Design a protein around this ligand. Structure first.
Ligand SMILES: *[C@@H]1O[C@H](CO)[C@@H](O[C@@H]2O[C@H](CO)[C@@H](O[C@@H]3O[C@H](CO)[C@@H](O)[C@H](O)[C@@H]3O)[C@H](O)[C@H]2NC(C)=O)[C@H](O)[C@H]1NC(C)=O
Ligand SMILES: COCC(CCO[C@H]1CC[C@@]2(C)C(=CC[C@H]3[C@@H]4C[C@@H]5O[C@]6(CC[C@@H](C)CO6)[C@@H](C)[C@@H]5[C@@]4(C)CC[C@@H]32)C1)COC
Ligand SMILES: *[C@@H]1O[C@H](CO)[C@@H](O[C@@H]2O[C@H](CO)[C@@H](O)[C@H](O)[C@H]2NC(C)=O)[C@H](O)[C@H]1NC(C)=O
Ligand SMILES: *[C@@H]1O[C@H](CO)[C@@H](O[C@@H]2O[C@H](CO)[C@@H](O)[C@H](O)[C@H]2NC(C)=O)[C@H](O)[C@H]1NC(C)=O
Ligand SMILES: *[C@@H]1O[C@H](CO)[C@@H](O)[C@H](O)[C@H]1NC(C)=O
Ligand code: NA
Lengths: 1139, 16, 122
């Protein structure tokens, strides 16, 4: 007995199973928001089982006054914590309030302790955070240096409001009304304005004054370094950043985009490269060390009737006749749409019985001659019989409502193509790998998302309902809240999709800033780390005549010359730069307009005359085999046709007026002229067959979700609105289309309106799923799906609530696994394209490698003993003390004291605070001048051998200029906007802290190694931005000022068009620019707006050329930016390899 | 209600 | 947050002749706007008896000066600090009964209700 007796129980797997299902039983009970009265005795059972499980474990280890037992394992501390908490609420009088019911989720962390294999994975993710320690010092350094730049430039600028000067307590009392400001179309956020020109204007009778709260809830500002640190972390995660972009340029001016282009490039690009490169480097040596470690007359006539069956489908193409009946069955289901008439639905409904009949007969005729139950042995035939069963269950009832989603479950036979099509099989192997060999890692991701959803629903769930009126319009819950488990799963799933900022404003407004900052930042640090490891583990396991000939030489010497190539490239850049001047204003100028019209002939007659020189110097055989001469041949033909129609007499026609829009192709002549653009194009077009075989899978795989979307939706996004206000009628007022047509005939203001990106077609379904896959536009589509009630009925709020699980499943499968198969094919083609060349480092040219192979030699070496001295004087004993580490470390500490005294600046601080901060910034300037002028006395001869002393001298001078010329600013010709900029020179002192940090310098050097290859790709992306800015400026300058197009950010001029194409290149808010362009006719737009003084009439858009504009720019910029990530992250593998 | 043309009246009202 | 939490003693036992503070705090998440905040204090002899309002907050304290109660009753709270307590000076045996506090703090949706059973000891 004794120890022997109470020990056996501990070892059996039967004892580890009832605890493992007790936790899973209780994890279901954490889901319930209000616990009922009857569940309380079940909560006592769970406390009894966990006591008994720790009773067998105290009685197994050591007895008779022998210390403890399991007081060494970190997981029995969690068991001791959860027992001592579960009884402390049963100690007569202990609590009452009990705000920490959120310690009841600690027993949901006991799943790690009891499920076999989850201690290894959680212990392998903490080990990988230890590798990230040196990146996270550089990220917090760069988000501080960039947060001090915006805190000097944009100080409260976000509090400019546009106040009216009184039409019919002076100052404080008048500027604090919130009705004296100007609100644009009910935005509840008080338009921003600037006194600067190229800033936002105010309408007539208003002026801009800094007085008010701040945007969004008070949470968006650059006044109090903590708030500037929040908004540059929001620019680093690119999370709705394009509202922060457009707020700031409206009140600072449109020339401060240079801050935003630099901070998206240094912060959102480089830091996301360096984080994802060091995680993938850490995981690469984890599975390497693991692999290395592992290295270290019944029967008679039954058979008579069978033989016949067997002697079939083993040689003719009757197993190939099924795969043509599947790809026909997919296409009949793809033709369903709304609204379709009868005699077309009759083809759809007779046709579905035909394929179902020959898929039920084909598996009946397969289980005759293949010996069941050795039929349920292959797996595909199990999969075949499962689809046939639910197809007859769907036909057998036809009463499911709304459970007819199963008529989309016959779309799942398309995966039978993965036997022959070998890229669809790679898609199934990745999805099956998450459930299989990486199954315990996606189980940890299941638990952490579950725990984060239970925690925030216990902390914040009661505060949302008791504080509704702060964050909502009619004192009810918002679309996104945490009052139950399902909505608090959807917030936690959102954060993992990149949208963590908008929900955090509504938490901080309702539960305080400290408790919502700690929770939501932990969700997006831990949760984005686990998704990133599950992404890489799926990736690295899956691909684990006397005069006639004598004129030929003369033309050849011309085209081969060095003064002729430099002439044409000069003529190419001016022909393309002349395209930038064709604004709305070009009719009003009347002097640059006629210069454009003479230049449109001179440019054309040069590129004709140089073309005929290329015919004579080459011949037709040499010229028509160069593909770059084919590109220059087609551009002349567009120029020849519109010239010879403007000379024959065909001035205006539907084609000839539309060929003039094809002058935006004229910048494509620059591709064959530069070696930077030519190398990158040759490396993208070389990978183009690999992309097409993946894009074929992605179009087949998103076809299944899109035919599923037409079945759920397609007719159910129609609604009536009061169009004098634009708000959706109630279900009590308008129930359906019949009630609304009753209003319109009664002369009300109603419109049966659709959503214009919807699921009526398969083709419009592809456009709906691309707003959902990118996370731009997906709020509007999901609010319509969840309200979708039925065809011809008014939508009701969240009636079809569980249709979020459609969008969750598409983001898991058609965005997380679709992107996982795409990245794995480009990287696999990158290693073969780098191998076929011999070979090395594509996207660099031949000159650009020799600048690279010597810069590599420079950054990995160091000199020895530069130390002459000041020889023998009083200066020598000065040189003894100043060279010491005591003088070295005391300057670094005193720069850290300078970094803290810049963080204490605040908008609207006191005058006595400004003086103290001036006299301390005086005595730092005299100290750092005295530190560098002392180097000149006691190190006379050089001082300028190494770079950090050259850097130290210039930073001192610009600080003095910011002090010395500032006294001339109060004496002479003044501009405060130049005072904000020259004062930014003392942030250069902060950069001297990098001098000692070795390991950040390794990150910064392999950063600077990729600047040659990233320059070549950034020119091919500036050329595509420039071409798409000329298409959009000519097409979209007159489009109505709806959602994303306003008086400030539009396609009117070339400056306006380039700040909109830079925005779409991150993909930010491309749904908002597309929305006014999908307007075609009235009631929406007006085809006769007559905006003087131009011949052009109308403010409508073209939906056909706008979908081709935005969708094609999203795809081209996706391929060229994902080569930027590959070119940089592979440089980070090249310096860790040689070290 | 409020104007459904703002991103906030979307997310935080029922009228839209 | 289905209802807004009002903290009172369910039973308050006070000696005849002493002063009885009837404590009554609430937590409502919105700030107390004196131009909209509402407080009513009533008395009823029994759970199924008539309620007599004796003090109200509407812009300011209104003491109804009920004849049987007297002028003894006083406000003893601070609405901005979420305290709506009252004081009954020199308590008499007839003061025994039920005292109800009803609280509205717009735009908070839920109305609060505290109920105190005051018992007068010898
Ligand atoms: C943009 O430019 C305008 C005009 O240059 C600036 O307007 C001026 O703003 C001041 C306050 O900012 C106005 O108020 C004046 O100051 C006293 C302070 O006690 C106040 O009590 C009075 O009401 C008095 O009006 C001043 O009237 C106004 N001047 C004019 C000509 O409108 C504005 O400050 C600038 N805004 C920014 C952000 O630069
Ligand atoms: C097998 O041996 C090959 C080896 C290197 C292979 O390791 C790979 C590990 C994954 C990793 C870090 C690699 C390259 C591209 C990386 C991707 C670029 C994409 O960019 C993003 C961001 C922008 C979005 C548009 C989507 O794509 C990320 C999601 C994607 C990304 C960060 C996911 C992770 C990828 C390297 C070479 O050794 C010398
Ligand atoms: C549109 O909705 C109205 C109201 O729901 C339908 O009219 C009927 O209205 C009475 C009372 O108003 C209800 O008791 C009936 O149940 C309604 N009929 C139905 C079928 O719901 C009207 O029929 C609907 N239009 C159509 C074409 O069905
Ligand atoms: C559509 O919205 C308007 C705005 O609320 C509703 O109210 C009318 O508003 C106009 C203009 O402000 C007034 O002239 C009317 O007097 C208002 N109506 C009433 C009844 O007072 C309007 O009723 C709405 N219409 C529908 C059909 O919903
Ligand atoms: C609707 O308006 C027209 C205006 O021409 C009028 O003739 C008609 O009677 C109106 N009908 C109703 C039901 O208001
Ligand atoms: Na967001």
């Amino acid at each position: 007995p004794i120890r022997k007796l109470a020990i056996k129980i501990l070892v059996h797997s039967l004892f580890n199973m009832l605890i493992m299902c007790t936790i899973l039983t209780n994890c279901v009970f954490m889901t319930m928001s209000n616990p009922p009265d009857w569940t309380k005795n079940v909560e006592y059972t769970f406390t009894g089982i966990y006591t008994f499980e720790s009773l067998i474990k105290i009685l197994a280890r050591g007895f008779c006054l022998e210390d403890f037992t399991f007081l060494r394992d970190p997981w029995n501390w969690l068991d001791f914590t959860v027992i001592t908490f579960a009884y402390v609420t049963e100690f007569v009088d202990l609590g009452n309030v009990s705000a920490l019911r959120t310690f009841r989720v600690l027993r949901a962390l006991k799943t790690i302790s009891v499920i076999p294999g989850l201690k290894t994975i959680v212990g392998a993710l903490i080990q990988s955070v230890k590798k990230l320690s040196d990146v996270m010092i550089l990220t917090v350094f760069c988000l501080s240096v960039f947060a001090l730049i915006g805190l000097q430039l944009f100080m409260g600028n976000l509090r400019n409001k546009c106040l009216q000067w009184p039409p019919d307590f002076n100052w404080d009392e008048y500027i604090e009304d919130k009705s004296h400001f100007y609100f644009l179309e009910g935005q509840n956020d008080a338009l921003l304005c600037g006194n600067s020109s190229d800033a936002g204007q105010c309408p007539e009778g208003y002026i801009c004054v800094k007085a008010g709260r701040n945007p969004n809830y008070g949470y968006t500002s650059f006044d109090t370094f903590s708030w500037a640190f929040l908004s540059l972390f929001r620019l680093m995660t690119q999370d709705f950043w394009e509202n922060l972009y457009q707020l700031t340029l409206r009140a600072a001016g449109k020339t401060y985009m240079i801050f935003f282009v630099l901070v998206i490039f240094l912060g959102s690009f480089y830091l996301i490269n360096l984080i994802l490169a060091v995680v993938a480097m850490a995981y690469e040596e984890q599975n390497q060390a693991t692999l290395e470690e592992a290295e270290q007359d019944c029967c008679k006539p039954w058979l008579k009737v069978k033989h016949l069956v067997n002697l079939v489908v083993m040689d003719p193409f009757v197993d190939l006749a099924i795969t043509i009946c599947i790809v026909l069955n997919t296409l009949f289901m793809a033709m369903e749409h709304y609204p379709m008439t009868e005699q077309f639905s009759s083809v759809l409904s007779v046709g579905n019985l035909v394929f179902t009949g020959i898929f039920t007969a084909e598996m009946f005729l397969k289980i005759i001659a293949m010996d069941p139950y050795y039929y349920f042995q292959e797996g595909w035939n199990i999969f075949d019989g499962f689809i046939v069963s639910l197809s007859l269950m769907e036909l057998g009832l036809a009463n499911v409502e709304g459970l007819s989603v199963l008529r989309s479950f016959r779309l799942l036979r398309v995966f039978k193509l993965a036997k022959s099509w070998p890229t669809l099989n790679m898609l199934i192997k990745i999805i099956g790998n998450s459930v299989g060999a990486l199954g315990n890692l996606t189980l940890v991701l299941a638990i952490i998302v579950f725990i984060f959803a239970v925690v925030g629903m216990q902390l914040f769930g009661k505060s949302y309902k008791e504080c509704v009126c702060k964050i909502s319009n009619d004192c009810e819950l918002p679309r996104w809240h945490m009052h139950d488990f399902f909505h608090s799963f959807l917030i936690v799933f959102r954060v993992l999709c990149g949208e963590w900022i908008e929900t955090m404003w509504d938490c901080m407004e309702v539960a305080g800033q400290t408790m919502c900052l700690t929770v939501f930042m932990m969700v997006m640090v831990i949760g984005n780390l686990v998704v990133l490891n599950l992404f890489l583990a799926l990736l690295l396991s899956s691909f684990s005549g006397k005069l006639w000939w004598n004129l030929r030489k003369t033309c050849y010497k011309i085209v081969e010359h060095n003064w002729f190539e430099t002439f044409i490239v000069f003529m190419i850049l001016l022909s393309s730069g002349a395209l930038a001047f064709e604004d709305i204003y070009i009719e009003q100028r009347k002097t640059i307009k006629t210069m454009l019209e003479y230049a449109d002939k001179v440019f054309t007659y040069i590129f004709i005359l140089e073309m005929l020189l290329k015919w004579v110097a080459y011949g037709f055989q040499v010229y028509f085999t160069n593909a770059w001469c084919w590109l220059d041949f087609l551009i002349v033909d567009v120029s020849l046709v519109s010239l010879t129609a403007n000379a024959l007499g065909y001035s205006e026609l539907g084609a000839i007026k539309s060929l003039r829009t094809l002058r935006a192709l004229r910048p494509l002549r620059a591709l064959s002229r530069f070696e930077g653009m030519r190398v990158v194009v040759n490396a993208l077009l070389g990978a183009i067959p690999s992309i097409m075989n993946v894009l074929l899978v992605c179009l087949i795989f998103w076809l299944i979700f899109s035919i599923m979307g037409v079945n759920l939706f397609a007719g159910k996004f129609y609604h009536c609105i009061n169009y004098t206000t634009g708000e959706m009628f109630d279900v009590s007022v308008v129930n359906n289309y019949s009630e609304c047509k009753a209003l319109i005939e009664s002369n009300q203001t109603a419109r049966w309106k659709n959503v214009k990106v919807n699921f009526d077609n398969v083709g419009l379904g592809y456009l709906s799923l691309l707003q959902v896959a990118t996370f731009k536009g997906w709020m509007d589509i999901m609010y319509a799906a969840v309200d979708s009630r039925n065809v011809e009925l008014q939508p009701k709020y969240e009636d079809n609530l569980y249709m979020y699980l459609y969008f969750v499943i598409f983001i898991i499968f058609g965005s997380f696994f679709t992107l996982n198969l795409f990245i794995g094919v480009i990287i696999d083609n990158f290693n073969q394209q780098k191998k076929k060349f011999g070979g090395q480092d594509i996207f660099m040219t031949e000159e650009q490698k020799k600048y690279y192979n010597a810069m590599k030699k420079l950054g990995s070496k160091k000199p020895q003993k530069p130390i002459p001295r000041p020889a023998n004087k009083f200066q020598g004993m000065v040189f003894d003390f100043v060279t010491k580490q005591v003088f070295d470390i005391s300057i670094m500490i005193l720069i850290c004291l300078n970094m803290v005294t810049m963080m204490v600046e605040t908008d609207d601080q006191s005058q006595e605070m400004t003086n103290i901060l001036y006299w301390i910034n005086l005595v730092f300037i005299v100290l750092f001048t005295g530190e560098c002028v002392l180097k000149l006395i006691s190190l006379r001869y050089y001082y300028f051998t190494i770079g950090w002393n050259i850097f130290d001298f210039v930073v001192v001078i610009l600080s003095i200029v910011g002090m010395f010329l500032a006294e001339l600013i109060e004496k002479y010709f003044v501009s405060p906007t130049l005072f904000r900029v020259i004062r930014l020179a003392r942030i250069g002192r902060i950069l001297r802290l990098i001098k000692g940090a070795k390991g950040i310098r390794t990150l910064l050097f392999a950063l600077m190694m990729s600047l040659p290859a990233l320059f070549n790709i950034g020119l091919l992306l500036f050329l595509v931005m420039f071409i798409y800015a000329i298409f959009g400026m000519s097409n979209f300058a007159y489009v109505k000022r709806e959602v994303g197009i306003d008086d400030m950010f539009n396609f009117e001029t070339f400056g306006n068009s380039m700040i909109c194409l830079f925005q779409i290149t991150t993909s930010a808010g491309w749904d908002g620019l597309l929305a006014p362009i999908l307007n075609s006719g009235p009631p929406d737009c007006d085809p006769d707006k007559d905006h003087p003084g131009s011949s052009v009439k109308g403010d409508c858009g073209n939906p056909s050329v706008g979908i081709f504009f935005f969708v094609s720019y999203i795809i081209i910029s996706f391929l060229v930016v994902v080569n930027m990530y590959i070119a940089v992250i592979l440089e980070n593998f090249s310096v860790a390899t040689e070290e | 209600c409020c104007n459904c043309s703002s991103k906030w009246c979307r997310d935080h009202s029922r009228c839209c | 947050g289905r209802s807004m939490e009002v903290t009172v003693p369910a039973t308050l036992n006070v000696l005849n002749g002493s002063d009885a503070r009837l404590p009554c705090t609430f937590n409502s998440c919105y700030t107390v706007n004196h131009k909209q905040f509402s407080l009513n204090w009533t008395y009823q002899e029994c759970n199924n008896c008539s309620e007599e309002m004796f003090l109200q907050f509407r812009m300011k304290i209104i003491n109804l000066k009920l004849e049987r109660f007297q002028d003894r009753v006083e406000f003893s709270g601070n609405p901005s600090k979420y305290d709506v307590s009252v004081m009954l000076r020199n308590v008499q045996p007839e003061d025994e009964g039920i005292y109800n506090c009803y609280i509205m703090n717009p735009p908070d949706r839920h109305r609060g209700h505290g109920k105190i059973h005051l018992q007068v000891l010898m």
